Ligand binder design. Structure first.
Ligand SMILES: *[C@@H]1O[C@H](CO)[C@@H](O[C@@H]2O[C@H](CO)[C@@H](O[C@@H]3O[C@H](CO)[C@@H](O)[C@H](O)[C@@H]3O)[C@H](O)[C@H]2NC(C)=O)[C@H](O[C@@H]2O[C@@H](C)[C@@H](O)[C@@H](O)[C@@H]2O)[C@H]1NC(C)=O
Ligand SMILES: *[C@@H]1O[C@H](CO)[C@@H](O[C@@H]2O[C@H](CO)[C@@H](O[C@@H]3O[C@H](CO)[C@@H](O)[C@H](O)[C@@H]3O)[C@H](O)[C@H]2NC(C)=O)[C@H](O)[C@H]1NC(C)=O
Ligand code: BOG
Ligand code: NAG
Length: 602
């Protein structure tokens, strides 16, 4: 007999309905299940009719694996899924949040805070475009991005994953979505999922909702705000995401006024689905449903009931799939979760799969492999890094000659600091490892390498990581570039109540700037206590977490391009002011949102 869902010429909705009507309960619950590659096996995938896989942070086939190795891994999982009775392809997800960042040799773009500084939505769209290509280079069809959190407190360990404290800037940067997925048709209905085809990926607006509003920036905590505040700060960018056809939405670990987002039917079903008319699929965060309870996981049967009844479609288990499937199956068999709820989740999952062309192109394209780390994408990252830089100081007094831009020709120059020759540090979290890492973790150019690549051949470049004052004074240097700042972190590891950079950092800046005029490059995921750094420095640049292309930094330092970045966040005078955002009644910033000095290209 003719099988409608297998017919590529049929409308998505007909294909969805035709497939759904054929599915057993096990096949339906299987679709709703996302598992980590580390627990996946061909038998597991086949026997449990698994709908999706993911790589968590740092979950890779091998250290240094090529694009083809990733393709082979993903395809191996896909072959198993395609061998089921109905042959429903799995969708493979990954945190490609500043490039395809788990992957060795992938272009690493500036983190979102830096992108906010660019005020350039089209640049971000292009980044989305390049990111989709490098994700597809690895056979992966789904990126967990953009994070459209509006970070209202930089003590949050994920503040770097927010474009801004200003929702208007976050809204503008939702242009990442049509970059990743492709532009929606002119006829498009807001809330429908969209992916253009096999050279694009499904995107994910995360984390719904108010993830950036938690008390004291405590990760995964309580967002205490009235409905008006939630709706005017934390919600707006989700509506833009609907308008641009975002395929999926991930739920936040956080709570709203003490209500776990993963158990919030009013917001997930009442608002996202029933008001915004979201028609893609809603996915949990990693063990997000376990974390509904205190302690986490102490009543998993409740977790499943609450989350599924709340309106979640796909669960990022990601390990204990047997318990998830068993419990959900029991709930359906006992009438606690109605078939209609299951049918809704599967309809949404399938709609996204059919829409993106997954049934027609379930396997990787080996011709895409060379998109990974492709030089054009690095040139784009280099542009973004440069645009992201915020110049905070350029001369100690009103009558001083501006230090920047620096001349490329000088007898001898000093490059110094813990962050001057450390690729891992300049990339920050979500790079190679979940938490990021130190040193030469991938392909890129450090600030020191960038300096050496930029200067006149007659310019002697000296590197000293932590030179003492005497070395500097005796060195015969024309000037110094000194780079310091935060170490890589991700999620809760980044929560920080004092926001002072680790030492040696300040001490190195003081020692260097004491001996020669200095340009201080601050690498951070957020504003940090900066007055002492400012006081020591002739010039100081907030470079955020600029990624693999350190030449973006030197492009501005040496005057190939003028500084144009403007603060996307308030720079506080002290942490005891926090939270403190633009528009507050008591607004007393060191630098207001939007501040930035400029230079002209030499
Ligand atoms: C010297 O460097 C300054 C940097 O501020 C340049 O002035 C600035 O030109 C920018 C355009 O390159 C303007 O930025 C704005 O950007 C947003 C978003 O990208 C746009 O929506 C908006 O329309 C602007 O383009 C900015 O307004 C301007 N800043 C000020 C106050 O001067 C300057 O560029 C030159 O002068 C300005 C006034 C413009 O006429 C530019 O077209 C022109 O290139 C730089 N001067 C030189 C010699 O290059
Ligand atoms: C927001 O963050 C705060 C601070 O972490 C959370 O409060 C803390 O909640 C945990 C429960 O997981 C408490 O730990 C427990 O303490 C009791 C002490 O008798 C102990 O018997 C348990 O073994 C466990 O360690 C912790 O005390 C508590 N701390 C504070 C400062 O209140 C809060 O739950 C978070 N809120 C949300 C909505 O996520
Ligand atoms: C103390 C809190 C422990 C956090 C452990 C959870 C690690 C995963 O964290 C989550 O994982 C998803 C998939 O990788 C990401 O897309 C989400 O943005 C992230 O919140
Ligand atoms: C401030 O907090 C962070 C995170 O807890 C910590 O790493 C840092 O060392 C702290 N600074 C000091 C000196 O207390």
């Amino acid at each position: 007999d003719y099988v409608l869902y297998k017919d590529a010429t049929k409308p998505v909705e007909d294909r969805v309905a035709d497939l759904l009507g054929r599915m057993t309960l096990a096949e339906k619950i299987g679709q709703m299940t996302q598992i980590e590659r580390l627990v996946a096996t061909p038998d597991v995938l086949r026997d449990n009719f698994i709908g999706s896989l993911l790589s968590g942070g740092g979950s890779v086939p091998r250290k240094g694996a090529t694009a083809k190795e990733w393709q082979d891994m993903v395809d191996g999982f896909q072959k198993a899924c395609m061998s089921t009775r109905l042959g429903i392809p799995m969708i493979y997800g990954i945190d490609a949040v500043h490039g395809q960042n788990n992957v060795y040799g992938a272009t690493i773009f500036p983190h979102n805070v830096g992108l906010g500084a660019t005020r350039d939505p089209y640049l971000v769209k292009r980044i989305g475009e390049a990111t989709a290509l490098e994700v597809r280079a690895t056979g992966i069809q789904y990126a967990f991005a953009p994070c459209i959190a509006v970070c209202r407190d930089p003590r949050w360990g994920r503040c770097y994953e927010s474009y801004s404290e200003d929702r208007r800037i976050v809204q503008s940067m939702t242009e990442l979505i049509p970059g990743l997925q492709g532009d929606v048709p002119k006829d498009f209905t807001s809330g429908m999922p969209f992916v253009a085809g096999k050279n694009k990926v499904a995107a994910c607006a995360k984390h719904f909702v108010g993830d950036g509003g938690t008390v004291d920036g405590i990760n995964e905590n309580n967002t205490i705000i009235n409905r008006e505040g939630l709706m005017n700060i934390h919600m707006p960018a989700y509506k833009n995401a609907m308008d641009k056809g975002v395929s999926t939405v991930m739920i936040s670990y956080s709570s709203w006024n003490g209500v776990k987002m993963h158990a919030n039917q009013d917001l997930v079903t009442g608002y996202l689905k029933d008001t915004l008319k979201f028609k893609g699929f809603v996915i949990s965060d990693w063990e997000g449903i376990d974390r509904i309870t205190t302690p986490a996981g102490s009543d998993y049967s409740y977790s499943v009931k609450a989350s599924i009844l709340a309106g979640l479609d796909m669960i990022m288990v990601p390990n204990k799939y047997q318990q998830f499937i068993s419990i959900l199956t029991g709930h359906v068999n006992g009438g606690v979760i109605p078939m209609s709820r299951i049918d809704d989740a599967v309809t949404r999952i399938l709609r996204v799969k059919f829409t993106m062309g997954l049934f027609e192109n379930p396997y990787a394209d080996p011709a895409m492999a060379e998109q990974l780390g492709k030089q054009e994408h690095r040139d784009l990252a280099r542009e973004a890094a440069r645009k992201s830089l915020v110049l905070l100081k350029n001369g100690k007094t009103s009558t001083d000659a501006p230090l920047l831009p620096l001349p490329k020709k000088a007898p001898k120059i000093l490059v110094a600091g813990s962050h001057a020759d450390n690729l891992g540090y300049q990339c920050g979290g979500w790079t190679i490892e979940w938490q990021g890492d130190t040193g030469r973790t991938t392909v890129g150019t450090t600030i020191l390498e960038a300096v050496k690549a930029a200067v006149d051949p007659s310019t002697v470049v000296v590197f000293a990581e932590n030179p003492d004052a005497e070395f500097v004074k005796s060195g015969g240097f024309s000037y110094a570039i000194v780079a310091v700042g935060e170490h890589p972190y991700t999620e809760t590891k980044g929560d920080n109540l004092n926001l002072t950079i680790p030492e040696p950092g300040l001490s190195t800046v003081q020692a260097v700037c004491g001996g020669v005029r200095c340009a201080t490059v601050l690498i951070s995921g957020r504003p940090v206590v900066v007055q002492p750094l400012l006081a020591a420095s002739d010039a100081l640049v907030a470079a955020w977490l600029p990624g693999s292309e350190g030449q973006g930094v030197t492009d501005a330092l040496f005057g190939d391009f003028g500084f144009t970045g403007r603060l996307p966040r308030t720079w506080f005078k002290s942490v005891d002011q926090l939270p403190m955002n633009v528009g507050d009644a008591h607004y007393d910033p060191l630098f207001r949102l939007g501040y930035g000095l400029t230079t002209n290209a030499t």
